[PDB]
Design a protein around this nucleic acid. Structure first.
Lengths: 165, 60, 170, 280
RNA sequence: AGGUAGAUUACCUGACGUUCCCAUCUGUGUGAACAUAAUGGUACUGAUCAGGCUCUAAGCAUCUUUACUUCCGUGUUCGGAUGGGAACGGGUGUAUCCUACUUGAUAUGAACCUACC
RNA sequence: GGCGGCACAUCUGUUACAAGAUAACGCAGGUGUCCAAAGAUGAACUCAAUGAGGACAGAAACCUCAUGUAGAAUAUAAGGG
RNA sequence: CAACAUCUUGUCAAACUAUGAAUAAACAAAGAAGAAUUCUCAGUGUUAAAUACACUUCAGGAAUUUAAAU
């Protein structure tokens, strides 16, 4: 039976990383957040002022407003049988840029490089390039032939039991 | 007459009969509490654009 | 052009400390003699932890002062004069410093009144080299190299070369 | 015998080193992160700092704005280039610190082209009174922040001599004139023009010839009288507000040790092992 | 090659020794004024007679440490599943996920802006 | 049921099951305060402990050097910083 | 012989921990309304000044391409 404190059950959650105490990097306060970005809430116990509630720890949210010192973040919270929208205002020390769209932005960039080539190619009248193939779950690999010149065989059989004492 | 205190039994089955009601799109587009200067710039342009739109209507 | 000039040992600090167990009367006079001896106001040191055996926390107990430069060298000679340049080999620390004690302050014995009284003193001398500032400066404060730092025998040789003092094994 | 050495491996496995520059004793990260923090709603708009560092022989002044990749220097000015403007000796005076601050202000405004409307003060009679650049038409002056570093800010420190030169050059650096050489004007003015240097010069002349020749040896060889300093810094100021725009080979390298490859390193142990085999 | 400002915050730390300094930096001389303290030691300011002795920087070592790789080991544990075996205790088989400590080999920094060489 | 206790308002660690929630008259403890400074800010400094030295002075008084990742201190319970 | 250091050994922690799974939690995989590009482009403000940047139905307006993105 725990208590109803604001920071209950935080012996391990709010502990600093091993050999990671003291000041934070200057990239945390220098990184520029724009409205619409994706950020991850990461409570920093070393800064007691403005510490976000521990339930929002590790939640990926979107930036909805940028203030002189605080970055508004919009995350989803689960209630009895519904989902509500929580709007916060955290200092940059307690957040971190999110890489949730890291690979998506490579596929957005690759299709734009092809499209920029296609418009030019149509200007010269030459046939245009095809769009990149979509990602697929690991497909059944096709048949193949193995050259036996550089192939060695090792027999596999159950092993005689050997005592570990 | 001691009674059972609490149980989470059957609670998840109840919460999913009518599943988690996601918020609508308009929930994410609220603007209350935005930056003060940003709201001032946006209001200034919306007033300027409306007046230009209205004088054409009055012109025709 | 040899760099031995930057390895010359010099006395950079001499500390005279008078430790009396009572506040007032004795401490006022003890500070007075140290001021007359050197020429600067000493400080009044307060106890760190109370000890009922010695009848002493916040009470001011002792007085001490440090002199540097030509004044430090002169007063050391007077302190060694009464000691007759007789220093045991154990008086020297492993860090290259040393010290000794004085039972009667010579000063002025003509008008030696019971008001002034007789106070004993202890001399402690801190040696150094040109280049020791690298550990005391405010910006980029570092550690002096091990070879640059003094040793017990290095201090002893300095004593036996600038004052012709002997060192005993008794 | 007894060691109880607290340097064992159990001590190092838990050790946490400081930031490299703080570990070197060159940067106060608790105050640096305050001079760096641009407002979050001013996206990527630089926050400029005047980085004033005085070595034993040079007054380094820089204008820097911070980025994640590093600190970028918009402009710089040193006191070793003062000989171009007529000041040949005493490059770390309160007087030379003013020239370095003035030179960097005029060098910067020349770069941005905004030096024709922002001129500051020029006459020598107003060197001692407070001046802060103001709005010209409706264009604000170039605002900068004074970064002092690990230097105590006393009431006569030279880091504010540079700031006074910057403000006199027309570049706005917020301040208060309670730490200048004055804090009236002529007391401040004299130190700006080397009055404190050209009174030790005369004082020592009367007292001792040995001390005078020991402290101002290169001044005597240069022929600088204890009266020329006042006019020298006036001319240097005049020659700075007319051409601050910097200036324009091969550098001779000197390699130091170079590393040992795995082959050389392994052969050293094998040879030493062979020596240990025959020696023992 | 060196200095100023940094970003990564030990591949950057620590111990033992070692190499230049031509510029630069440092240590270095002084106390008159701004300023400073019990002390010109610090901080402040004025300077250039000397020096690579320390700092700094570069490298050395079957170096502690730290950082990647393999191995440890598909061994610990685990999600799913019997009218499977056992009096219990606990532990199979099936479709699966798969650590850690240790040990061995390697590395001991990369990189951004400005000035000078 | 009574007697006993407060699990009745309330905090920390643990049971507790690496999101959130979370039982027992489960375990180990805590609150009904204290503070014109123990609030705000600027500056300077570095702590516990250990070794080696110094008249009385010794195991414990005061002074100096070296090592010292916090092993000190932070009003209070415990856990965080 | 203590004791103190230093090197091994045997066995442990719900209120010890460097390391740390499996199962899980919360994102993204194209809705100011299915993309993109080009040209033109205004109101405020940040800014030293901006043609940069921020917000304004990715202010707005016009052309071409386009239904693609486990």
């Amino acid at each position: 039976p725990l208590s109803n404190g604001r920071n209950r059950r935080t012996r391990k959650l709010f502990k600093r990383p091993f050999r990671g105490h003291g000041l934070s990097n200057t990239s945390t306060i220098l990184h520029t957040y724009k409205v619409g970005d994706y950020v991850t809430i990461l409570c920093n116990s070393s800064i007691q002022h403005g510490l976000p509630y521990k339930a929002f720890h590790g939640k990926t949210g979107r930036v909805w407003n940028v203030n002189p010192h605080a970055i508004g973040v919009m995350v989803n919270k689960k209630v009895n049988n519904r989902i509500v929208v929580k709007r916060l205002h955290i200092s940059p020390e307690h957040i971190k840029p999110s890489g949730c769209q890291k690979d998506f932005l490579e596929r957005k960039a690759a299709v734009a490089a092809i499209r920029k080539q296609n418009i030019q190619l149509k200007k010269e009248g030459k046939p245009l390039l095809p769009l990149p193939a979509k990602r697929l779950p690991k497909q059944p690999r096709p048949a193949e032939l193995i050259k036996g010149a550089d192939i060695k065989f090792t027999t596999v059989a159950p092993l005689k039991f050997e005592e570990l004492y | 007459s001691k009674d059972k205190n609490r149980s989470s039994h059957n609670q998840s089955h109840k919460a999913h009969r009518n599943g988690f009601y996601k918020p609508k799109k308009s929930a994410y587009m609220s603007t209350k509490g935005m930056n003060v200067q940003v709201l001032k710039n946006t209001k200034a342009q919306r007033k300027f654009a409306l007046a230009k739109k209205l004088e054409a209507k009055k012109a025709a | 052009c040899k760099s031995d000039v930057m390895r010359k040992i010099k006395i950079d600090k001499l500390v005279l400390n008078i430790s009396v167990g009572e506040s007032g009367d004795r401490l006022t006079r003890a500070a007075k003699v140290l001021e007359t001896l050197t020429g600067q106001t000493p400080v009044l040191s307060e106890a760190r932890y109370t000890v009922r055996a010695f009848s002493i926390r916040n009470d001011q107990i002792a007085c001490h002062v440090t002199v540097r430069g030509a004044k430090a060298a002169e007063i050391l000679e007077k302190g060694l004069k009464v000691k007759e340049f007789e220093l045991k080999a154990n008086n020297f620390s492993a860090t290259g410093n040393f010290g000794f004690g004085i039972e009667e302050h010579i000063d002025l014995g003509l008008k030696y009144d019971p008001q002034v009284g007789i106070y004993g003193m202890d001399f402690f001398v801190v040696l150094a080299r040109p280049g020791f500032r690298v550990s005391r400066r405010k910006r980029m404060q570092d550690k002096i190299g091990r070879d640059h730092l003094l040793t017990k025998e290095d201090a002893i040789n300095w004593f036996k070369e600038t004052y012709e003092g002997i060192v005993l094994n008794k | 015998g007894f060691l109880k050495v607290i340097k064992n491996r159990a001590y190092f496995k838990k050790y946490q080193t400081q930031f490299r520059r703080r570990r070197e004793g060159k940067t106060d990260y608790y105050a640096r992160r305050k001079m760096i923090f641009q407002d979050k709603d001013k996206f990527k708009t630089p926050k400029y700092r005047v980085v004033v560092r005085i070595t034993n022989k040079t007054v380094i002044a820089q204008i820097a704005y911070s980025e994640i990749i590093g600190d970028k220097i918009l402009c710089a000015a040193y006191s070793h280039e003062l000989p171009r403007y007529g000041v040949k000796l005493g490059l770390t005076n309160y007087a030379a610190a003013y020239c370095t601050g003035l030179l960097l202000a005029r060098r910067l405004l020349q770069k941005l082209g905004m030096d024709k409307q922002f001129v500051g003060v020029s006459d020598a009679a107003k060197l001692g009174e407070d001046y802060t650049p103001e709005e010209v038409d409706e264009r604000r002056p170039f605002k900068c922040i004074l970064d002092v570093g690990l230097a105590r800010t006393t009431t006569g420190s030279k880091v504010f001599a540079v700031l006074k030169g910057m403000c006199d050059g027309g570049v706005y650096v917020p301040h208060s004139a309670t730490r200048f050489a004055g804090a009236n004007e002529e007391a401040l003015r004299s130190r700006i023009l080397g009055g404190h240097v050209a009174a030790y010069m005369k004082y020592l002349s009367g007292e001792d010839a040995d001390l005078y020749k020991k402290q101002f040896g290169r001044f005597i060889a240069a022929g600088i009288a204890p009266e020329a300093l006042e006019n020298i810094y006036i001319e240097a100021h005049k020659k700075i507000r007319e051409n601050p725009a910097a200036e324009k080979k091969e550098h001779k390298k000197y390699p130091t040790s170079k590393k040992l490859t795995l082959e050389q390193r392994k052969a050293a142990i094998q040879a030493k092992l062979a020596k240990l085999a025959q020696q023992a």
